Amino acid sequence: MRAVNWNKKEDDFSLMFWKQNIAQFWTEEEIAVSSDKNTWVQLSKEEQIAYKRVLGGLTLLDTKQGGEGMPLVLVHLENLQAKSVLAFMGAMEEVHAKSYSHIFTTLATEEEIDEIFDWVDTHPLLEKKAGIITSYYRRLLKPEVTKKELYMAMVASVFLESYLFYSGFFYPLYLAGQGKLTASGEIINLIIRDESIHGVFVGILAQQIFAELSAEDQQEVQKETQELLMELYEIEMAYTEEIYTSIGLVEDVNRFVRYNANKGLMNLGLEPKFEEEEINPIVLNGLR
Amino acid sequence: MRAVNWNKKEDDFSLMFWKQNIAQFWTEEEIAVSSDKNTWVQLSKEEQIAYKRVLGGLTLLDTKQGGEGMPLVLVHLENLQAKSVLAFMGAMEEVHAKSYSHIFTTLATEEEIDEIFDWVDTHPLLEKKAGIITSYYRRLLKPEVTKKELYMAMVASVFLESYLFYSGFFYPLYLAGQGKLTASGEIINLIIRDESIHGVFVGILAQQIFAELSAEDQQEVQKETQELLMELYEIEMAYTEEIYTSIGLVEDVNRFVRYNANKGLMNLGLEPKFEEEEINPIVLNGLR
Ligand SMILES: [Mn+2]
Ligand SMILES: [Mn+2]
Ligand SMILES: [Mn+2]
Ligand SMILES: [Mn+2]
């Protein structure tokens, strides 16, 4: 049985991603968020509700990526160096999820927080979205998987990392780009710095597997990938309508969703599917 | 679908273990090992071979714990806070495995390193030991597992964390207790600090699951646990004879193995099975 041997490279990229994920290591204790209270209380009721709801959705996605997506993809990898990288990435999803609780503790009462997490658990669109992604992961709960199954789990992972988070990341970035909730915005920026490299790395692994598939299997997973992209898009457009209509930001968020969907596709080596548009300028300042 | 909510405790210990595992975070870049070369050359060929072989064995066990044990146990936990802790522990197993490679790079040529990893992969006792442990993990590759199956995977994990490593940890500690390879000894001590809390934590989870089982299932897994302990003990005694006869340390290592087997049992809430003996005094000096 093989032990991981970093003296003999299994690929040309796992070491650099290992080092970069460690270099980016952080935990929530590093960013105090209490100073956000001064701008939090200046938001309207509708703005506060949107913020809490999107954070709840982000927590759900990170919960599933750390507890299902990364573990079940990594257990089926043959490349032990890449497995190492995915194990660290999965731990960082748990760090991310805990950081959202850290933000909640400053912005809400214990009762309000438990109300948000009940809203998340019972939400039909979040349940549908997370069920679509995790179905690909749970297909891997068997000893022998096909490369089509592993590839599509990696596609689902890239779409979560590079695309599904961004209807939620929009609002902390949009507020931070205006000087509102800037400490929470700093945390979200650390999270995005991690998810960006997560999506790139899993997309590399996916492209490697894709190249080993037969032409027939390649055609099949290309179809599944484009169908999954649009299945998720329909759900995302319903979600943005629900979250952002009250605060007048639906079309801005939809533009941002499409921009990031194109990035997810590019991480998989695929052509963009949505017309190119420039990021919202305030969001861009919030990333600055 | 539920998101992890740290504002509502799911148990009375996962937060403290989360905080402790983060507090203990380290990576190999923090300990330069090159200064060990001066004492490395003072060792004999036989001593160097034993050191490289036991490090190879440790690397194999960490490879399997990070790549199979922690992921497959955590995927089947219902407690999302405990799941978070296990994901971080799994990542640290990959840090540990990489740190052994860092030591190898100082102590051996590239050809010598690849020879050690081939010796690991073909070794019959390491194959048998790792196969026994990972068989329990691989039973979890299905959509739903029984509590008996989960419990026995946790037992296997505690036996790996608290017992199987120690026939290997012995020799770095013994040499460090004599002032030899002290930088590598510092690394091994960081690893041990982590494995100690890994074994305690998984042992708590195991005791919880055990208490949930029917009486018939309890009787079954009690017997299987004691059988497993002694199946592994027989293999460990063969392994220590093989590794340590050349350098005259077999009975010392066997005493240390029994001491740590008792610790694994205690981490599972079980009575010790081996006679009490005090830790070898040289090893004890290597631990401080
Ligand atoms: Mn994340
Ligand atoms: Mn991620
Ligand atoms: Mn370890
Ligand atoms: Mn461990």
Residue numbers in the entry:
A (entry chain A), B (entry chain B): 1 to 288
Q: What does the article say, verbatim?
A:
Here we show that the class Ib ribonucleotide reductase R2 protein from Bacillus anthracis spontaneously assembles a Mn/Mn cofactor in vitro, under both aerobic and anoxic conditions, when the metal-free protein is subjected to incubation with MnII and FeII in equal concentrations. To study metal selectivity and cofactor assembly from a mixed MnII and FeII pool in the presence and absence of O2, in the present study we describe apoprotein crystal soaking experiments, subjecting apo BaR2b to a large excess of both MnII and FeII in aerobic and reducing anoxic conditions (in presence of 30 mM sodium dithionite). Site-specific metal quantification by X-ray anomalous dispersion on WT BaR2b revealed that the two sites of the metal center predominantly bind Mn irrespective of the presence or absence of O2 in the experimental setup. Unlike R2lox and R2c, wild-type BaR2b is able to select Mn over Fe in both binding sites. The capability to exclude Fe appears central for a protein requiring a di-Mn cofactor for function. If Mn binds in both positions, neither the wild-type nor the L61G reacts with O2.
